[PDB]
């Protein structure tokens, strides 16, 4: 369960 969205996003 790795989602690139979870670890990369603009705060």
């Amino acid at each position, epitope marked *: 369960d790795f989602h690139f969205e979870v670890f*990369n996003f603009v705060p």
Partner: antibody
Amino acid sequence: EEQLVESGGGLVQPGRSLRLSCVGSGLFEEHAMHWVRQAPGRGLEWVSGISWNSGSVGYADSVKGRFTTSRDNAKDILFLEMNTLRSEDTALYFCAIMVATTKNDFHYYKDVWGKGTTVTVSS
Amino acid sequence: QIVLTQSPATLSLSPGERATLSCRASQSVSNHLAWYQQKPGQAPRLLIYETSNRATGIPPRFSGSGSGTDFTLTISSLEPEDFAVYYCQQRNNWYTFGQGTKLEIKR
């Protein structure tokens, strides 16, 4: 001007434990944190990564079931609890923020690295 | 996870010349590939993120390109700074670095 500082490294015997901390500046914060290590004269190896809310945690297969990554937003401290230590985990351990995305072609990246703390495992 | 192999292992060039470094993945990493530069005694530093985008302050002479499995980092005419170790990195399935490509001055 945000910075990361690691601590907890040092000399430890094989099969023993050490515990590293990585403190980011100030306050939760909205970025994932990762552990990256480098053995002497070798390349970089991703150790572990934890999402901003500790909802997602991963590890390289080399350390799986031996190390445990956690974090606390309130203190903005990242932890690497190291168990069942081996000589092959002797390395310089970096704490790093590695965020990068181009969603909606909105370019955003944040890449911050600590100077690292040293881990030496030997009898 | 995904394995990244870098070629050349060592690249020997003169300043003013121009470098092409390859990084191939065993399985497709989409466009989530970054390039890092590292010199002795220093933490690594981001050059390119998401295949082709330069971090702030990165000279235009660096450019990234590729898709899925094949990627390349190009240095159009090398400066003395640029001779160091370069790592490709994927963040499609967790994070993985390549074994590194060392860029040496040819004499």
